[PDB]
Amino acid sequence: FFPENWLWRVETVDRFQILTLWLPDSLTTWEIHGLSLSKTKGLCVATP
Amino acid sequence: KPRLLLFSPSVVHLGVPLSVGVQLQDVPRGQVVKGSVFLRNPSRNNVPCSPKVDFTLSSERDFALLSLQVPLKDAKSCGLHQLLRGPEVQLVAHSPWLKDSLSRTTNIQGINLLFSSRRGHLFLQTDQPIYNPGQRVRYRVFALDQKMRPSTDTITVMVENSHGLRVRKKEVYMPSSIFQDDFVIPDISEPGTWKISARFSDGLESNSSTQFEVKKYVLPNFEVKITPGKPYILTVPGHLDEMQLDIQARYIYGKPVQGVAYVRFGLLDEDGKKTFFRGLESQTKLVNGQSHISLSKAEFQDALEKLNMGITDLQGLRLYVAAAIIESPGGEMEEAELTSWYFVSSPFSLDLSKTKRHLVPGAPFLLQALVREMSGSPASGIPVKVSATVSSPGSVPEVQDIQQNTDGSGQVSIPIIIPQTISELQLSVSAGSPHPAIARLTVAAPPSGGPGFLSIERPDSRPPRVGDTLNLNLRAVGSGATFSHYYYMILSRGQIVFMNREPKRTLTSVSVFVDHHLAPSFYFVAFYYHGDHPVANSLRVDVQAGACEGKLELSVDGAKQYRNGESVKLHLETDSLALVALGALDTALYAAGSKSHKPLNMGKVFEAMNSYDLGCGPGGGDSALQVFQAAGLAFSDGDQWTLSRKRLSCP
Amino acid sequence: NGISTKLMNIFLKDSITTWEILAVSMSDKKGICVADPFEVTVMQDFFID
Amino acid sequence: SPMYSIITPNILRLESEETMVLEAHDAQGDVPVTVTVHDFPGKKLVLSSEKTVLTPATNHMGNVTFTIPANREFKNKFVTVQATFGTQVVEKVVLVSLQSGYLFIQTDKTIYTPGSTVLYRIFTVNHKLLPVGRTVMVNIENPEGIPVKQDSLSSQNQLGVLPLSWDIPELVNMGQWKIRAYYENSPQQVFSTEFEVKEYVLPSFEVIVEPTEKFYYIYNEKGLEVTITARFLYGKKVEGTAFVIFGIQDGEQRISLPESLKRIPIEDGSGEVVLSRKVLLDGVQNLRAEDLVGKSLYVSATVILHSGSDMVQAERSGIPIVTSPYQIHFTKTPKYFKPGMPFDLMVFVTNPDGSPAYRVPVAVQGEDTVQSLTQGDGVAKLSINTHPSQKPLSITVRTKKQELSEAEQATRTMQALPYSTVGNSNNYLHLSVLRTELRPGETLNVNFLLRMDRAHEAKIRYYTYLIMNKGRLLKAGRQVREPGQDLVVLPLSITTDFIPSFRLVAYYTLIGASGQREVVADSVWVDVKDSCVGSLVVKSGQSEDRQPVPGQQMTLKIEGDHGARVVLVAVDKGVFVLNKKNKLTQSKIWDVVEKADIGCTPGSGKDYAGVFSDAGLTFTSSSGQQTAQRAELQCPQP
Numbered sequence A: 001f002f003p004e005n006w007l008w009r010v011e012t013v014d015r016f017q018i019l020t021l022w023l024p025d026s027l028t029t030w031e032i033h034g035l036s037l038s039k040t041k042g043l044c045v046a047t048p
Numbered sequence B: 001k002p003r004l005l006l007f008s009p010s011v012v013h014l015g016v017p018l019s020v021g022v023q024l025q026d027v028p029r030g031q032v033v034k035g036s037v038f039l040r041n042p043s044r045n046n047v048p049c050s051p052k053v054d055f056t057l058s059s060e061r062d063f064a065l066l067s068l069q070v071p072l073k074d075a076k077s078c079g080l081h082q083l084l085r086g087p088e089v090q091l092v093a094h095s096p097w098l099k100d101s102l103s104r105t106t107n108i109q110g111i112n113l114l115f116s117s118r119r120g121h122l123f124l125q126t127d128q129p130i131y132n133p134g135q136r137v138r139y140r141v142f143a144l145d146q147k148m149r150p151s152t153d154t155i156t157v158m159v160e161n162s163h164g165l166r167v168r169k170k171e172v173y174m175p176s177s178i179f180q181d182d183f184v185i186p187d188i189s190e191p192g193t194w195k196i197s198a199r200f201s202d203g204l205e206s207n208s209s210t211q212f213e214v215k216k217y218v219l220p221n222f223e224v225k226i227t228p229g230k231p232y233i234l235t236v237p238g239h240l241d242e243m244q245l246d247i248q249a250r251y252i253y254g255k256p257v258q259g260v261a262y263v264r265f266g267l268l269d270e271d272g273k274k275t276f277f278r279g280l281e282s283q284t285k286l287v288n289g290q291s292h293i294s295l296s297k298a299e300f301q302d303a304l305e306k307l308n309m310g311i312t313d314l315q316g317l318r319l320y321v322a323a324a325i326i327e328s329p330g331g332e333m334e335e336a337e338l339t340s341w342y343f344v345s346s347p348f349s350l351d352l353s354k355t356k357r358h359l360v361p362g363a364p365f366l367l368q369a370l371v372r373e374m375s376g377s378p379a380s381g382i383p384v385k386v387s388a389t390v391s392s393p394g395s396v397p398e399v400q401d402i403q404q405n406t407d408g409s410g411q412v413s414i415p416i417i418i419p420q421t422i423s424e425l426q427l428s429v430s431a432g433s434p435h436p437a438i439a440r441l442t443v444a445a446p447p448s449g450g451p452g453f454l455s456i457e458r459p460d461s462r463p464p465r466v467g468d469t470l471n472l473n474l475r476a477v478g479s480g481a482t483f484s485h486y487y488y489m490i491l492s493r494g495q496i497v498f499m500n501r502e503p504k505r506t507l508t509s510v511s512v513f514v515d516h517h518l519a520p521s522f523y524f525v526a527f528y529y530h531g532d533h534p535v536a537n538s539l540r541v542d543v544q545a546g547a548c549e550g551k552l553e554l555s556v557d558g559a560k561q562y563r564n565g566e567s568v569k570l571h572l573e574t575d576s577l578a579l580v581a582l583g584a585l586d587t588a589l590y591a592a593g594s595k596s597h598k599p600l601n602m603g604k605v606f607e608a609m610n611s612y613d614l615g616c617g618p619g620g621g622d623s624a625l626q627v628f629q630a631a632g633l634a635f636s637d638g639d640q641w642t643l644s645r646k647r648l649s650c651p
Numbered sequence C: 001n002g003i004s005t006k007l008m009n010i011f012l013k014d015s016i017t018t019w020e021i022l023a024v025s026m027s028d029k030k031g032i033c034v035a036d037p038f039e040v041t042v043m044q045d046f047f048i049d
Numbered sequence D: 001s002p003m004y005s006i007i008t009p010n011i012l013r014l015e016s017e018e019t020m021v022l023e024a025h026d027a028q029g030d031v032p033v034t035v036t037v038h039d040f041p042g043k044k045l046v047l048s049s050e051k052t053v054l055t056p057a058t059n060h061m062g063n064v065t066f067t068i069p070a071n072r073e074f075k076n077k078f079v080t081v082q083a084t085f086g087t088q089v090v091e092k093v094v095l096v097s098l099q100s101g102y103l104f105i106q107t108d109k110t111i112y113t114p115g116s117t118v119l120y121r122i123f124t125v126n127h128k129l130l131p132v133g134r135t136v137m138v139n140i141e142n143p144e145g146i147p148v149k150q151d152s153l154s155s156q157n158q159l160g161v162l163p164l165s166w167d168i169p170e171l172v173n174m175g176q177w178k179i180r181a182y183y184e185n186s187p188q189q190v191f192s193t194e195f196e197v198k199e200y201v202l203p204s205f206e207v208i209v210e211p212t213e214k215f216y217y218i219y220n221e222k223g224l225e226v227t228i229t230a231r232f233l234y235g236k237k238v239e240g241t242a243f244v245i246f247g248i249q250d251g252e253q254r255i256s257l258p259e260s261l262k263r264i265p266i267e268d269g270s271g272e273v274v275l276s277r278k279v280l281l282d283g284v285q286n287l288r289a290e291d292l293v294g295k296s297l298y299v300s301a302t303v304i305l306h307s308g309s310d311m312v313q314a315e316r317s318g319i320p321i322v323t324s325p326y327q328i329h330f331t332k333t334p335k336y337f338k339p340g341m342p343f344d345l346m347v348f349v350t351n352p353d354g355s356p357a358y359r360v361p362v363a364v365q366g367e368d369t370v371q372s373l374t375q376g377d378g379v380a381k382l383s384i385n386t387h388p389s390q391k392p393l394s395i396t397v398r399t400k401k402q403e404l405s406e407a408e409q410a411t412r413t414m415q416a417l418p419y420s421t422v423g424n425s426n427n428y429l430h431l432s433v434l435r436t437e438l439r440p441g442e443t444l445n446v447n448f449l450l451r452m453d454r455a456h457e458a459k460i461r462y463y464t465y466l467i468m469n470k471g472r473l474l475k476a477g478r479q480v481r482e483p484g485q486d487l488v489v490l491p492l493s494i495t496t497d498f499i500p501s502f503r504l505v506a507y508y509t510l511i512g513a514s515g516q517r518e519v520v521a522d523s524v525w526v527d528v529k530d531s532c533v534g535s536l537v538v539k540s541g542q543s544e545d546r547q548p549v550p551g552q553q554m555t556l557k558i559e560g561d562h563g564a565r566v567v568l569v570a571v572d573k574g575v576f577v578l579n580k581k582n583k584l585t586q587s588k589i590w591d592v593v594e595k596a597d598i599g600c601t602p603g604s605g606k607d608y609a610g611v612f613s614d615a616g617l618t619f620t621s622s623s624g625q626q627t628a629q630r631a632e633l634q635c636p637q638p
């Protein structure tokens, strides 16, 4: 398994959430981004 | 003598409420006024395509901030979209008090605004920056309104080819403010850059775009970076500094690279013509993954003379260095190039865009400068010398010299004093020594005989954060103390936010709480009436970029190192229920890509929010109407009014 | 430019903890300065006892 | 007529440089100057005698530095300072006292066990935080107060660092031991640090139970939420089940709640349990919800591992039940305000247990536009413009956190009195400064603002400003003012000499309307970031590409001032966390220094003499203008 990207899902969060990731078999340094879209706090990106 | 003021943003964005501030000036205590305010098309007919909003004012409450909706249905009904030339709509405030009291010719008072069609924000994301031909492309687009909350409106995305031809179009009905889609690049697609756009269906000019490069590539194994010793070369005839570079090779997973670096030098002009030196090449091994190379002055001058050129011609040229290292004994080769090593005649820079212009006489004039290294981070501790010549007020001009060392981020605020009856001020700024960076600025004093001036002083000259109160000191200079209150207002993201009334004392101080709806900048406009004429001043404050309205912390507790197939615990935390849009990307893609393609970070979001603003310049004006026009208002009391905007972009 | 760098080597102990080195410097020209704690997290995965 | 002025610190110290500021106003030519100091009771002898000449080039500004020898010829010891200003003479009697220094004791841990070694260092400094070679006695005392170890050390040639070690026997008194250190010369000042001996305890794993809030609000429908955290001694988390039970506590009787027993799964190493308000109300069978105020709750948790049968217990007793959790105070506000000009406040909001609050909005009552947010240290800074009359100003501050009602919010009221004009002349001076924290290397713009009748404005050509730091007089100067200008900005550089908060006192003098003399003065207190004059950073010399492994070699890099002496110690970080009561930090050191300032009133006084005396200054002129003599060595209580 040598993908160039993974984890393209959109998971809701109820003030907290823990996700388990199975790292693919590539030998690199993955950068994981993430956004937010809340009806009462607007958009907010997160540090990769 | 009694007057009814009227303030509104210069540009109307259809389908978004308009912040209209009304004010009552010089009214007897026994008079209570009531009326309505509405939009109006001047051409078709006086057909108000906006819900009339009522307002009531009195002596104790002489101002009121109204929100005036401009729905799409009514705006389309009045023929605002059937106008031939000029997207201009009028705003009218009608009240029977005008005719009864002032005995005016007509009881209609308003301004000529300029509507637009932009609305809301759209952000597009793709799977990866650079794609192989014939590879699937996954993109998602988020939609928000001007309030920065998620929106359920309908957009129409469209992909574009490298030549500019449309390739795919779609229309969506978002119930969750996110739209995801996949499409396949044709297998024979030529290399280029594709663009994906997305606009609101109703709003013609509400588009937003992203780009992704298409190129045939194989993902690399290690990255090569060339770092100059200094980001500049001094070509001053006095001396030429040393030219030294460090080339580093690093595998993607961190370990250094063993190999041989082959480097070639040459000249490169802004046009794009490269002239290599047939010689001066370097072939050195890599120790710890880094190799240190340099070009001596003697060999460089010999190479220049062999090219039939002198060191005087190095004005706009830059030294171009290309490297192609070969890993050993793996055999894989990778290349890197540098196109940012300019030839300069001064190692510093000056940015006087923060300094105001045409400021009031009788109060200190603050010169604000941002000394920055040539292609580098802002400097600190670099002395700045200012020679300010106050031109002839009636006598010979007088000069002043002030020196101050930059503190941090290069900011320097030098309070040059200016006398009354000044004619003009000439400013000569020199940063650093030796080889200083020189800038000039000329300021013209306002015409004499004015009704006074207003001086807005900021005790702290640093960008406020979010949640910190800000204090400004209002004072009236060269005027008669006949009034009783200072009237001030705030303008953030192109809409009036706050409007208050502060009593007049000696050095009146106003406190504004920097909330989350004022970022990333705002305009503070204050004024007062000296008899029958307004005296106004403005000021721009840049809120420091920091955290969001909410929060999102993706944290993986533990060491960075891992092994393939391991299980990783990823924690997500917010302040409410949110739709986290996750994505994990390889890093070798950046190395593969020829050009940098930065992702969506908070800088882009902040630029998106403030791109709706109408303010222009750092503030200040020769009169009240000029101040309001620079701020982005539309003032009309009955004797003065601001002419309509000629185009959306300030000159 | 006023900063003096000294490289000192230490032998980590055999405890699976997170040490916090505390440094305080004394100088006759400027006085006493207290450095921030430095965290060294010692970790291991397989232990045979 | 020329007026000659003399300015000097309120209290002079022996064997330390002292600066004396000399001035001549409306005096032509140059004037020779001779300043002498004698004994107060009889002027028997001269402790010091300096001379200088005031030239018109420097606007008759002069500073003469003298050192008072430790002769100890006589006995609150006073000395009279007499300055001959040409023919004229001005005399002022100033109090004298000597300060010894400071001792800082650093212990690696605060909780030991019988058998372990106690390692402690003594740092010797003077009033300027510089190493000094003295003789210091160090004692170790058990809880009963019986000195078990006594040592006499000399820090000379040791660069101000004294290392010491003590070996705890296997059978010692259990309690709170103390370490006492004092200089031999002045045994009246003893500096103490305390630790505990305790007994050997070592659980299988560590569990921490704490609520999200620091109290409980009765009308909070969400209930009380508690976060149970568990982790092994080697770092990895715990996965198991926790049994939690709550309970009220009416003073000393625990009416445990049976219905609140819950079982929760600890996954990832952290859990969460909520106590419903209905359960708590029904537990005490009381219909009145307000009756539970003052009855603190407690939580007992029992964590059970999932693999074996290991069990550990945790508790968190004393969660108050309060309806007005936040209490509000003033900290560093002046008490005298110049009428018609802005007045700066400062507010401190604290939790029921006495800890500073965080992100609690505050706001003055009736203005609504002067809001702010409480910072990390509990300080919220506001400004309110003052009325133009001379009636006293009453200012009220209230916290505006949304959860509580209006009647339950904190409120504090303060009254300020107007600055007293000399002859009802309505002449004032105002200094406006930024109300934030500065850093060395930054530049500060102080706005000198002047208000008076437009008939004597042209008779003022300058302002004189003095900077007070660490009690001593830092620097002085002049601010030339072009006639016709009301506001004049002084660009003031900030260096490492300003590291603890300094004070700026400015004044101008002019002939009165009637014909007498006039002195108008103002002052401000400015706080800058507390950090060492130098720098000291410890990092990893080796490439950061591996987590440290047991027993392997690691390379450290220390960067600091050249020629300095660096001392190290490594701690577990399990005892560092619980040491929050008192740690050796730069902020604590600078606070210890700041506790010995000459002046204590923040920024103003009733008269010009009040302004000069509050800042820690004296001012005597050839005319009948002078500040009242100070005889006490500590100003009255706050």
Ligand SMILES: *[C@@H]1O[C@H](CO)[C@@H](O)[C@H](O)[C@H]1NC(C)=O
Residues within 6 Å of the ligand: B205, B207, B208, B209
């Ligand atoms: C929107 O489209 C216009 C042309 O209609 C284009 O000039 C503009 O740059 C676009 N705006 C973006 C991409 O933000």
Ligand SMILES: *[C@@H]1O[C@H](CO)[C@@H](O)[C@H](O)[C@H]1NC(C)=O
Residues within 6 Å of the ligand: D019, D062, D063, D473, D474, D475, D476, D477
């Ligand atoms: C004292 O005078 C000396 C003269 O060299 C000057 O350097 C110093 O700054 C002065 N101090 C004060 C407090 O005026």
